[PDB]
Symmetry: C3
C-alpha cells in the first residue's frame, strides 16, 4: 500500500495476516512441520527515492510477528526481523545494498521456493548464502548494464557474524549468481564460499576451514503453467542435529534435488505438486543420511491479490530408522491469508 | 487511518500512544492495579477486500508495545500480539475467521468492559472463551441470514494450545453466543466448554476434565446514558494464584457480577461508575474466596475522536484477610491518550 | 510521510533502514564501538490534532528493530521502544506531555550529539535526566508565553522506576532547562536531581542519596557552519562498569567535555570533527579514570532528505592501562541510510 508518493520519494507499507493451523500425528514431535496453531503476521516497508535521473536510493524492512504465542512469558517466541537493508541503484551500472538480506544462492533456490506453505527446505536462514543472512553487501546488475533484456548477475560479500551459536554464525565470504530469462523460461547458477568460525569448527559434526554452497535452477513460467527444478550441493554448510546423541554442527556434504509443478486455473485455484530430497554424506558417526525426503501435494485458492486460502500436504518419505532422528511423519497445513 | 482504497481493497492503519500512571500505596504490591508508570502504545492494521458482490475477505493484526520498560534487558516485558486473524464473509450467509481473536464469551463480557482504564476483570487473556486466545475458528451470522435485524449468533471452535504453562494453555473446545439489539437495548448470552490439558490437571488448584464459561449481558445505550450488566459463571476456567502458598491453577467455580453506568455530556466529559464482584468457590484448601470486589468511580474527557484524558479510581473492597492473598489496596490511574 | 490530514488531525508514519558496519581490531571486545554488523531499523508514528483555536493534542511513538541478530533465539536482542508519549499544547501558555521521553538535560546535550554515528556519549538511556527515560512529565514553554522569540524553558518531573537492575532504575526527581537562540547562536543550561533507589545504593560503585546532573551548551549554527560545545558534571548518576572486578554502579563524580565542528557543503557533504572526554572521579578502588576520551573525524553525504551515507572514525585516546577496563582500540563506522 503506497502511503507516500511525492517529490520522487515513494513509500509502501505492506503486511499480511495468516490464519494457519498444522495437523500431524501426536504432538507432531515426529513429523515434518509440527502440529497445532501456526498463525502469524508480517509487517514491513519498502521505499525508493529518486535522487537524480540516473540515481535511485532505497530501503526495506520486514518483520515477523507470531500470532500463536500466548500474551504471557512466551509472547516474543519466533518474532524476528527478516529484512533490514538500504542501498543505491545507478542507471545502467548496477545497484548496491547492505544489511540483513537474501544470500546470493537464493537467486537460484528461489525457483522452487513456491509451495503454498512448505518447500524451500534448503534455503535455511542464517546459513551463509542460501537464505536471509545478516551483514551482506550485494551488488546486482539488471539487464546487463542495460544491454541485455533478462540477463542478470550478482556479487555478494558476506561479513563475519560471530554469534553465540555455531548454527547462526559465519566467517567472511564472497559469492555470486548469474541468471537468464527469456519469455517464461529461466536458467540460473549461483555459488558462494566463506570461512567457518572457530565455534563452528568446534562442533563434532562437520570438519573444514571453508563452507561452500551452490545451486542451479531451471524454470518455465507461462501459459498458467509453472515448472521448476533446482539442483545444489553444499560442503560444511548445511546445519544438522543428531537427535539421538543431542549433538550438532554441519553436514560435510549434501546433495539437494527439488522439483515443482503448478497450474493456475483462471477461476483462482492453483494446485501444486513437488518433490524434495536433501541428502547428507560423510556425516560423522553415520555416513550417508537423508535430511529431507517428501512429495508435496497442495493447492492455493486466490480470491484476488489480497485474499487466499490454501492447503499443503507433505507425504514424508523419511523413515523411522533415520539415523539423525529426522522426523518421519507427514504434516498438513491449512491456512487463510489476508494481505496488503 | 486509510492508507489504501483502490480496486475493492482497503487498508486501515491504527494505533495510540497512552501516557499512563498508576498510584497505589507503597510499591503497589498489595493493590488492585499496582503502582508506577504504565505507559504503552498500540499499533495495528485492518483491511477488507471485496472479492465479488457477495464475498468479502478481511484481516486484522494488533500489537501492544509497553512504554514503561527501560531500553535494557527488560525492553520486551509485556509486548505481545493481541490479535492476528484473517477471514471471509459471504452475503447473508455468515463470516468465518481464524487466528488469534476474541473468545465468544467476550460477546457478552464486552457489555461492561467500558471503564476509562480498569474493569473487564473476567475477560482474562489466554483463558478459553472469555478474552483474546490463539487458534480460534469463529463463525458469525449477522441479522440472521438477512432475515432479522439485530439478531446475531456465533459458533466458535477453539484449537488446543499446549503451552509451557497451565495458565496459558487449553484443550479443544466449542462455544457460542446469541444476541439481540433493538435500538439502544441489547441482550446477550454466551457459553463455551473445552478440555483441560494434562498440565492443567497437574495443578493443585482446580480439578475437572472440562473447563466451562458462560455469561449473559443486558445494556441500554441511548440518550447519552450507557447502562450495562453482566452475570457469568465458570467452572475450572478462571485462573487463580494463592500468594501465601505460591500455588496456581484454576478456581473450581466462580460467580461473576459486573455493573456499569456512564453518562456522556455533549461537551465531552463521560463520568463512570461501576461495581464488580468475582467470587471463587470450592478452592482447595480455602473454600469460598473473593477474587475481585470493588467500586469504580472515574471519568474520561474526550477532546475529539483523537485526543482524550481520564482518571479511574478503584475503591477496593477485598480484605486484608483475603485467603488467596488478593491485594486489598485501592489504585487510581491517570492517563492521556492520542489515537488515530 | 503523511498518512492522514483531515479535520484538524494529522498523522505521520516515519522510519529508516540503516545498513551499518563497525570495524575494530579483534572481536572489537576492547574497542570503542565494537566490531561487526550493526544494521538496524526504526519505525515510528507522530500525530497532532487541533482541538480548538488554541489547544493542540499530540502523540508519538518510536521503536528500534535491530537488523544484526539471527532469526534464532537472539532475534529480539536490542529491540526497544525509544519514545511513547502523549500531550497537550495550549496557545502561548505551554505544553505538557507524559510517557517515555527525553530527559531535560538532553535539552543541553543535544547541542553536541550531531556526529554521523558516534558522539553524545553522556546522553545515556535510562539515566535520570540525560537521555530517554521512562515515566517523565514534561512542561515546556516556547518563545516565553509568546513574549520572547527564541527564549525557551522547561520543567520536568521524573517518576521513580524501580527496575530489576541498578543501571536502569531511578527514584523520584525534578529538573529544568532554559535556552536562548538568536540568529544562529544558542545558549543553554539544564539541571536535574533525583533520588537513588535502595538497589542503586546497594552497588559497590557510587555512594550518595541523590543523583545529580547538569550541563551547559553553546552553539553557532548558520552559514553552513555548525559549532558546538557542551560542559557537564554529574554526581552519583553516570553508569560505570569495572571490567576487571566485574562490578557495577555509578561514578561518584564526572566531568564532561564535548566539542563538535561541521560544515555543510551545498552539494551534500558534511565533514565533521569532534572531541569528547568524560572523566570519573572518586571511583571506589580506583580514583580518577577516564570513561570516554577520543577525537572523531567523519563525514555524512546527504543525497537528499531521504538517502545518505556516512563514515565515522573514532581515534580513541583511552589507554590500555585504563583502570576500569574501558576499551582502548579505535572504531570506524560505515553506514547507508534510507529514511522516510
Ligand atoms: C446461556 C447461554 C446461551 C447461549 C448458547 C449458545 C450455543 C452454545 O454452544 C456451545 C456448545 O458447547
Ligand atoms: C560558540 C561555539 C563554540 C564551539 C567551539 C568549537 C569546537 C571546535 O571543534 C572541536 C575540535 O576538536
Ligand atoms: Br507480506
Ligand atoms: Br488502538
Ligand atoms: Br533501558
Ligand atoms: Br527515523
Ligand atoms: Br547490534
Ligand atoms: Br545507553
Ligand atoms: Mg549467519
Ligand atoms: Mg568437510
Ligand atoms: Mg488493565
Ligand atoms: Mg472442579
Ligand atoms: Mg551510538
Ligand atoms: Mg558519591
Amino acid at each position: 500500500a503506497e502511503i507516500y508518493n511525492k517529490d520522487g520519494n515513494k513509500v509502501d507499507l505492506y503486511g499480511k495476516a495468516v490464519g494457519l493451523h498444522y495437523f500431524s500425528k501426536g504432538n507432531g514431535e515426529n513429523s515434518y512441520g509440527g502440529n497445532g496453531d501456526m498463525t502469524y503476521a508480517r509487517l514491513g516497508f519498502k521505499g525508493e527515492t529518486q535522487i537524480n535521473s540516473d540515481l535511485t536510493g532505497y530501503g526495506q524492512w520486514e518483520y515477523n510477528f507470531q500470532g500463536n504465542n500466548s500474551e504471557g512469558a512466551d509472547a516474543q517466541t519466533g518474532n524476528k526481523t527478516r529484512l533490514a537493508f538500504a542501498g543505491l541503484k545507478y542507471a545502467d551500472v548496477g545497484s548496491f545494498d547492505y544489511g540483513r538480506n537474501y544470500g546470493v544462492v537464493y537467486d537460484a533456490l528461489g525457483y522452487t521456493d513456491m509451495l503454498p506453505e512448505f518447500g524451500g527446505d534448503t534455503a535455511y536462514s542464517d546459513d551463509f548464502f542460501v537464505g536471509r543472512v545478516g551483514g551482506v553487501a550485494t551488488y546486482r546488475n539488471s539487464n546487463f548494464f542495460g544491454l541485455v533484456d533478462g540477463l542478470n548477475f550478482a556479487v555478494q560479500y558476506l561479513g563475519k557474524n560471530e554469534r553465540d551459536t555455531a548454527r547462526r554464525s559465519n566467517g567472511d565470504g564472497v559469492g555470486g549468481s548469474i541468471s537468464y530469462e527469456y519469455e517464461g523460461f529461466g536458467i540460473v547458477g549461483a555459488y558462494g564460499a566463506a570461512d567457518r568460525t572457530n565455534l563452528q569448527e568446534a562442533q563434532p559434526l562437520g570438519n573444514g576451514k571453508k563452507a561452500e554452497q551452490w545451486a542451479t535452477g531451471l524454470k518455465y513460467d507461462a501459459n498458467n503453467i509453472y515448472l521448476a527444478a533446482n539442483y545444489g550441493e553444499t560442503r560444511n554448510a548445511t546445519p544438522i542435529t543428531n537427535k539421538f546423541t543431542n549433538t550438532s554442527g554441519f553436514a560435510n556434504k549434501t546433495q539437494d534435488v527439488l522439483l515443482v509443478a503448478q497450474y493456475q486455473f483462471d477461476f483462482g485455484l492453483r494446485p501444486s505438486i513437488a518433490y524434495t530430497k536433501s541428502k547428507a554424506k560423510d556425516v560423522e558417526g553415520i555416513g550417508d543420511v537423508d535430511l529431507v525426503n517428501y512429495f508435496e501435494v497442495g493447492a492455493t485458492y486466490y480470491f484476488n491479490k489480497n485474499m487466499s486460502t490454501y492447503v499443503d500436504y507433505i507425504i514424508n518419505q523419511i523413515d523411522s530408522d533415520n539415523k539423525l532422528g529426522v522426523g518421519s511423519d507427514d504434516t498438513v497445513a491449512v491456512g487463510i491469508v489476508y494481505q496488503f
